C-alpha cells in the first residue's frame with residue numbers, strides 16, 4: 093500500500109512505501125490518536141528473527157544481499173544465539189546500526205546529517221573509570237574547539253538485565269538545580285532530582301546558577317560512581333545581545349555541546365543501554381525551552397522588564413517580544429564565539445530537503461510533527477505546512493526508565 | 504482503556520473515559536500515526552438516531568423515561584415509513600451545541616454552551632438563504648460586540664436537493680491572477696473568485712474585495728448576492744507605535760464565519776450550516792498575513808522596520824511577525840471589535856479541558872491544531888498532552904460543491 097503526504101504551501105505530494113517495513117507499534121488505534129503523548133531480558137525465541145531482519149537490512153545496504161558472506165554471517169550469528177543466547181555485532185554492523193537509529197529517529201529535525209556520525213566503539217569497557225575516560229574523549233572529540241562534530245559512544249550491550257551499563261545523567265553536560273527552603277529553585281529546575289542524587293553520592297555542590305553536574309556512571313550493573321568532567325573540556329558561551337547592552341548583565345550562559353546520555357540504542361534485537369550521542373544545538377532549544385519555559389530558567393519577565401514592554405496586558409504580546417530578543421541573543425552569542433549552532437529557519441528548511449530526498453531514495457521518512465515543528469514561529473517555518481507520517485523503524489533510539497528507579501543497590 | 508493525559512508544565516494528570524464512546528475512525532493505526540494529515544440507508548439510520556436520542560435524554564436527566572421511549576418509538580416509526588426523520592427544536596439546538604463541544608480542533612470551545620441557533624429548516628430558495636444569512640451576519644456582528652451563532656438549512660434528503668453555501672466563509676476577500684503572474688488580493692480564493700466572475704460578478708479587482716455569496720437551494724444552480732456593505736464590519740490595521748504601518752493599507756473583517764462544513768446530528772446531514780464566533784489574533788496576523796501562499800507580507804514589513812534581511816539568524820521574520828500581530832490585536836481593540844489573543848485563548852482552553860474532564864470524563868483535542876502558529880511553547884497548550892478522537896454530533900468537511908454539482 094502507498095500513502096501520500098502533501099505540503100500545503102507548495103502542493104508537493106510525496107508517496108510513502110517505507111511504512112510497510114515498520115514493525116513496532118505507535119500507541120494510536122483507529123479510534124484514538126496518541127500523537128501528542130510524550131511517552132506512549134530477551135530470549136533466543138524473539139532474538140534470531142530480530143537478528144535476521146537487521147542483517148538482511150545491512151547486507152542489502154552494501155549490495156551483498158544473498159551473497160556467501162551474507163549467508164555465512166546469518167549461520168554464524170544463529171550458532172552464537174543458540175549456544176550463548178546472544179551475539180556480538182561486527183564493527184561495520186555497529187556503525188551501520190547507530191547511523192540508522194539516527195536516520196530512523198522520527199522526532200529529530202537534524203537528520204540531514206545522519207550519515208556523518210563518528211562512532212566510538214566502547215564495548216571493551218569494564219569499569220566506571222573506563223567509562224569516564226571514554227566520555228572525556230567523546231566530549232573533547234565532539235567539541236573540537238567550537239567546530240562541533242556528531243558522535244556516539246557505545247558501551248557494552250545488556251546481557252541478563254543485571255549487569256547494565258548506564259550513564260545516570262540525562263545529558264553529559266547539564267547545570268545543577270537546587271530546591272531552596274523557601275520553595276524557589278537555584279539553577280535549572282529540570283535537574284533538581286538528579287542534583288539531589290549527586291549530593292547524596294558525595295558531590296560537593298558549589299550551589300550557583302550554572303554549576304556543571306558531575307558524571308554518575310554505572311558499569312556492569314555495579315553502583316554508580318562520581319567523576320568531574322575536566323572544566324577545560326566544557327565549552328561554554330556567555331549570552332549577550334547585539335543591540336541591548338544590559339543583556340550581558342543578566343548573567344546568562346549555556347554550554348555548547350548537547351549530549352543526550354539516557355537513551356537506549358536497539359540494533360538487531362541487542363540493547364545498548366549506555367550510548368551517549370551528541371550533535372549541535374538548534375537555537376530554540378536554549379532560547380525558547382531552556383530559558384523561557386516556566387518550568388526551567390523562566391527569564392521572560394525579567395527580560396521584558398528590562399526592555400520596558402507593556403506587561404499589564406498579555407495582548408501587548410510582551411512575552412512574544414521578549415522571546416524573539418532572547419533567541420537573537422543565543423544565536424549571536426554562539427556565532428560570535430564560533431561555536432556551531434543552527435537557527436530554526438535554516439534547520440527546518442534543511443529537514444524539508446532531507447525528507448524529500450528520503451522519500452526519493454528510501455521510499456519514506458518517518459517524522460513526528462509535534463516534535464519537528466519548532467516551539468516558536470511555527471507557521472513561518474516550512475515544516476508546519478508539511479504533512480508527515482510517524483511510524484517506528486529499527487534500529488532505533490528508545491526511552492528507558494531512570495536508573496535510580498530500577499537499580500538494585502549493592503551497598 | 505482508561506487513559507491518562509499529563510500536563511508537563513504543571514504535572515496535572517487527567518483520566519479520559521469519554522473516548523470509549525467514540526464511533527468514527529481517526530486515520531491512525533497501531534502501525535502509523537496520521538495526526539498531521541489535514542484530511543484523514545434506512546438500515547443505517549436508526550442506530551444513529553438511537554445513539555443520539557439516548558445522549559439527549561440522558562443530558563436532560565430522563566434516560567429510560569416514558570417520554571424517552573416514546574420518542575425512540577416515534578422516530579423509529581417515522582424512519583420506517585418516511586426513511587428519514589425530523590429533529591425537535593430542542594434536539595436540534597442540543598445537537599449543534601454538541602457538534603461545537605466535540606470539535607477537537609477548536610481552541611474556542613469554553614464558549615460551546617453559548618451558541619445562538621437559528622433554525623432555517625423552513626427555507627426553500629436562495630433568496631430565502633440570502634435573507635437568513637444577512638440576519639445571521641447582523642446578529643453575530645452586533646456592532647463589534649460579537650456573538651456566536653449558527654444557521655441551519657434543511658437536511659440532506661436524497662442528496663440531489665442539497666442546500667449549500669459555495670463560499671468557504673461568509674466573508675472573504677477576492678483573489679485574482681495578474682498579467683504579471685503574481686496575485687492580487689487573497690491567493691486562497693483565486694478559484695472561487697473565477698467561479699463568481701464566470702457566474703456574473705463584476706469584480707472591482709482590488710486587494711481587499713469582499714466576495715459575493717453564491718448560494719444553492721434545493722440542488723438548484725447557485726445564485727450571486729452582495730452582502731449589504733453596511734453589514735460587513737472591517738478593521739483598518741495600524742500599529743500602536745509604528746506610524747508607517749497604516750501606510751501598508753492592510754485591513755481585515757471582524758466576523759470569522761465558516762460556511763462549507765457539514766453538521767451531522769443523529770445520522771441526519773445538514774450540508775449548509777454556516778457558523779461564526781470571533782477571531783484569535785494569530786489567525787489573521789500569523790496565517791492570513793504571513794503565510795507564503797496567503798497575503799505574504801513579511802518582506803514588506805521587515806523592510807519598513809529596517810531589519811537586516813541578509814541572514815535568517817537575525818530572526819528578522821520572527822521580529823516582523825510579532826509586530827504584525829501586535830498591530831492586528833491593537834486595531835481590533837481600538838475599534839471595539841471582539842478579538843482574543845493566543846495567550847488568553849489557550850489559557851481558556853486549558854480551563855475548559857479541566858471542566859470537561861471533570862464533568863464529562865474527557866475532551867477530544869487535536870494538539871496539531873490547538874497549539875497556535877506562533878510562540879507555541881510559551882502557551883500552556885504546548886505542554887498539555889491531548890487525546891484525539893471523533894464524537895458525534897460533529898462538524899465534518901465535505902467536497903467543494905463545484906466538483907459535485909450538476910449544472
Ligand code: HEM
Nearest residue numbers: 194197199200201202205242243369370371372373374489
Ligand atoms: C547534528 C545536529 C543535530 C541537531 C541540530 C538535532 C536537532 C534535534 C532537535 C532540535 C531535537 C528535539 C530536541 C528536544 O526538543 O528535546 C532532536 C531530537 C532528537 N535527535 Fe537530534 N539533532 C542532531 C543530531 C542528533 C544525533 C547525533 C542523534 C543521535 C545519533 C540525534 C537523535 C535525536 C533523537 C533520538 C531525538 C529525540 C529525543 C526524544 O524523543 O526525547 N540527533 N534533534
Ligand code: HEM
Nearest residue numbers: 603606608609610611614651652778779780781782783898
Ligand atoms: C467563539 C470564538 C471561537 C474561537 C476563538 C475559535 C477558535 C478556533 C480556532 C483558532 C480554530 C483554528 C482555525 C484555523 O486555524 O483555521 C478553530 C477551529 C474550529 N472551530 Fe472554533 N472558535 C470559535 C467558535 C466556534 C464556533 C461558534 C464553532 C461552531 C459552532 C466552532 C467550530 C470550530 C471547528 C469545527 C473548527 C475546526 C475547523 C476545521 O477543521 O477546519 N468554533 N476554532
Ligand SMILES: Nc1ccc2ccc(CCNCCc3cccc(Cl)c3)cc2n1
Nearest residue numbers: 130202350352370371372373374377511
Ligand atoms: N541538538 C540536539 C541534538 C540531539 C538531540 C537528541 C535528543 C534530544 C532530546 C533529549 N531531551 C529529552 C526531553 C524529554 C523527553 C521526554 C520527556 C521529558 Cl520530561 C523530556 C535533544 C537533542 N538536541
Ligand SMILES: Nc1ccc2ccc(CCNCCc3cccc(Cl)c3)cc2n1
Nearest residue numbers: 541542611759761779780781782783786
Ligand atoms: N475564529 C474562528 C472560529 C471558528 C472557526 C472555524 C473554522 C475555521 C477554519 C476554516 N478553514 C479551514 C482550513 C482548512 C482545513 C483543511 C483544508 C484546507 Cl485547504 C483548509 C476557523 C475558525 N476560526
Ligand SMILES: C[C@H](O)[C@H](O)[C@H]1CNc2nc(N)[nH]c(=O)c2N1
Nearest residue numbers: 128129130462463885886887888
Ligand atoms: C505534550 C507535548 O507532546 C509535549 O509538550 C511536547 C510537544 N512538542 C515538543 N517538541 C520538541 N521538540 N520537544 C519537546 O520537548 C516537545 N514537547
Ligand SMILES: C[C@H](O)[C@H](O)[C@H]1CNc2nc(N)[nH]c(=O)c2N1
Nearest residue numbers: 476477478479539540541871872
Ligand atoms: C500539515 C499540517 O497538518 C497543517 O499545516 C496544519 C498544522 N496545524 C494547523 N493548525 C491550525 N489551527 N490550522 C491549520 O490550518 C493548521 N494546519
Ligand SMILES: [Zn+2]
Nearest residue numbers: 120125531536
Ligand atoms: Zn495518531
